[PDB]
Amino acid sequence: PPLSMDNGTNALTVQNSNAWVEVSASALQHNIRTLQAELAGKSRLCAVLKADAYGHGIGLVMPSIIAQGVPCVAVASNEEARVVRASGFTGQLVRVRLASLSELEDALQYDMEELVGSAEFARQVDAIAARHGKTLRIHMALNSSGMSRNGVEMATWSGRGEALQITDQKHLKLVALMTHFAVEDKDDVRKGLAAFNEQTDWLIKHAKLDRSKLTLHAANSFATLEVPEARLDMVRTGGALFGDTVPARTEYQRAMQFKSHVAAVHSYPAGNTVGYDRTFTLARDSRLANITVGYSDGYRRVFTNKGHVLINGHRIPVVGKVSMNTLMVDVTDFPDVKGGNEVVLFGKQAGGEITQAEMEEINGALLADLYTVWGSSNPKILVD
Amino acid sequence: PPLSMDNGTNALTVQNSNAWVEVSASALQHNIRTLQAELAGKSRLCAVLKADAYGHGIGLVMPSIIAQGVPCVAVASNEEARVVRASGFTGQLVRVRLASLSELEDALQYDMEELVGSAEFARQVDAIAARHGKTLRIHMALNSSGMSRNGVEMATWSGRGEALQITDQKHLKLVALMTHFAVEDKDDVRKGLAAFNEQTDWLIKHAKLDRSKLTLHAANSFATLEVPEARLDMVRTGGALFGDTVPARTEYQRAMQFKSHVAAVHSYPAGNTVGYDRTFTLARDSRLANITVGYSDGYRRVFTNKGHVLINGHRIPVVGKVSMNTLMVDVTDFPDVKGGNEVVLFGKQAGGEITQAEMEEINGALLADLYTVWGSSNPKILVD
C-alpha cells in the first residue's frame, strides 16, 4: 500500500513492491470497444468506476475512458469524483449511491449529479444547494427491481407521493430516473424492467415531467449483456469494463492480476509444523517458499491451507496460517522455484491459472469482495 | 480511501469521508507508557509498526514513538520504512519479515536492519551490500519455536552449518539473533524459549561471537506480558501498543474505532426483499437505514445478515447482502435514527459495544485480518 500518492498515482515499481496489482490498459480499452460495439449506438455508456475503479485505480483507468470518448462516469466517493475531474473529464458524472449530507455538500464543487431516494432526503439536499446558490442535478432512484436500498418504493401510493414531493424541490433539477436489478437472472431482470417501465411512465405522466429531458437507466453489466431491452437511454457497466462479468462472455478480457515475490526458499525437516498454531505438519523433508504477501495485503486468512499460487507456471499450495505480511508455500516438488521468482496470487502464468471460481469457493463470496480490497492494500501498476 | 496522501497523512475529515478509522492518540500514548513501565527499564522496547501500524497509520503513530523515546521500530515494507525515516525517527529500524532481494536493495537508503534466515539468501544479500559499498546490519532469524517461516532450523546439523555460513559474510554485520513464537500459550512459549537459549548458546560459542555485541529477542506482545523470562534484551510488541492483546490485560486501551454515516432512512412495505439475491424479507412495514460503507471499504460480505452496528447507542442489525459501497440496517425499532447520524461499525457508542469477539465470530478469523484492511481502505483520523 503506497503511503504517498497523487490523484491515484504512485511512485512505486514492481521491484520495490512486496505485492502488486497489475492493471492491463489494453484489456480495458478492448472491453470498452467491445461494449461500445454491443450498444451499437442505440444506448449510451456510463463507466461505473466506484471502489476506485473496482480496485483497478480510478487514476490509472481515466485516461482510457477519456481516450475512448466515454460520455458518462459513475463513482461512489468524493475522492473518486475529485480524481475524475482532475483528470480533465468534463462529461456526465453521477454518484451511484446515496451520499450523506455533508459528503454531498463537499462534492458540489465537482458538478456531480446526485442520487435521491426520499422526500426527506430530497428536502435536506435542497436546502444545502440553496445555501450555496447551486442547482443540483439529481437522479431519482426507484425500487423497481426491489433492492430496497437507494430507491423510492413506487409500487405503493406513499412512494408515488414521495416521488411528487421530490419533483417539487426548487434547487434540484431532475435529470434522470433509475433502478438497479437485484438478481442476475434474465426472467427476474425482465420482471424488474417491466415494473420500471410502468413506474417511470406513471411518474412522467402524473408529475407532468418531460420525457425528453430525462435519462432512464436500469442496466448493469449482466442486464446490458443478457437483456438488450433493458438498455434504455444509458447503461451502467462496472464489471464488464474489467472482464468480471458473465463467465460465457469471453470476449471481455480480465484487466487485473494479483502478484508477489518469493523472498527465499528454506529447508525444513519432516515433522516440523508451519505458521501460527502449527496447523500444518510437514510429512517429509521440505523446501518451503517464503512469499512477501499476507492478510494485511488483502491475501485473506481464509486462504489458510487452501490457497494455491503460481510460480514458474507451477500450481503450488499454501501451507499453515497466512501471516499478516508473509505467506508460506510448499515447493518440495518444484526444485526450480528460486528467491526472486514472480508469484501469481490471482491470474495466469505460463499455462497455469488461478481462477475466479476457485477463489470464490474458498472466500465464500464473489471475487470483488477480495479484489476491491487488493486494489487498496497494494500499489497498482499499469501494464500493456 | 484517500487518493492523495503525503507520508501516511491525508486532507480528509469526518464530514467528507464515507467511512473512517478513528485512532486514539491518548490510547496509543497510554499503551506505550504502560509497556515501558512494565518493562521497568530491564529490556528494550521495539514497536512493531507492520501493516501501516496495524491499520492505525504509521505517519500518525510516529510522533508518539519519538516523544516517548522508543528506541526501536519494526516494519515490513519499504514505504513504512520510508515514512518512519521521514518522520524524523533516527533510531533502530528493523524489518520483521524476509524481504525480496530487490526490495532489500531499494531499502538500503533507510539504513534498515534486515532479517536473514538462509545461507543462500545471506550470500545473495552479501553481494548487494558489496555492490553498494555498505555493511548491512542483519538480524538472524532462528526457528526455535517452529514457525518455519523466516528462521534457520538450528535443530539440525545442516541448520547449524547454514547459521555459521551466515555469520561468515564479509559485508554483513550480525547485530542480533531472534525467533518468533508460534502459539500464544505460556507452556508452548517456555518450550520455545528454552530452545532459543540453547540454540543461541550453541551459535555464540561456535561462531565465537561477542555476546555483548548481540541483541537477543524473541517476545511479541503475549510473551512479553505472560512470560517475562522471555523478555531478554528486547521485545517486539505490536498489538499491545493498540490494545489488541490478552483480553484480561485491560490496562492496554483500544486505539481504533471504525465508523460511518447514515445517508438516509427509507420506508419499505412488508414483503419487500433487501439487497442482491433477495436474501432478507421484510416481515413488517419497515424503516431501513442506508449506511455509506460497503465491502470495498473492508466491511466484508461475510457480515451479510450477520453484522450489527451502533447508532444513537442502539444495537442495530445488518439486513441483506452487504453491497460494494452501501450497507442496509433495520431501524424499524429505532425511530430516533436520522440522516446524519454517526454509525459505529467497530467500537463503543453511548453504552453499546461492537466487540472484538463478536466480529471474530462472524469473520472466522482474528480481528487484525479485518482492521489492517479497514486502515488501508478508509481515511485514518487522529483523535484524543
Author numbering:
A (entry chain A), B (entry chain B): 26 to 409
Provide excerpts from the study.
The asymmetric unit in the Bar crystal contains two molecules. With the exception of the positions for the first 25 residues, those of all other main-chain and side-chain atoms are well defined. Non-peptide electron density near Lys75 was fit with an aldimine bond between the Lys75 Nζ and the PLP C4A. The Bar molecule contains two domains: an N-terminal (α/β)8 barrel, which contains PLP, and a β-stranded C-terminal domain. Two Bar molecules associate to form an AB-type dimer, and their positions are related by a non-crystallographic two-fold axis. The subunits have essentially the same fold (root mean square deviation (RMSD) = 0.219 Å for equivalent Cα positions). In conclusion, the determined structures of apo and L-Lys-liganded Bar present the internal and external aldimine linkages, respectively, as well as the anchored substrate in Bar. Two water molecules contact the PLP O3P in Lyr and Bar, filling the space occupied by the tyrosine and PLP in SpAlr and BsAlr. The Bar A393Y mutant exhibited detectable, although reduced activity towards L-Lys (55% residual activity).
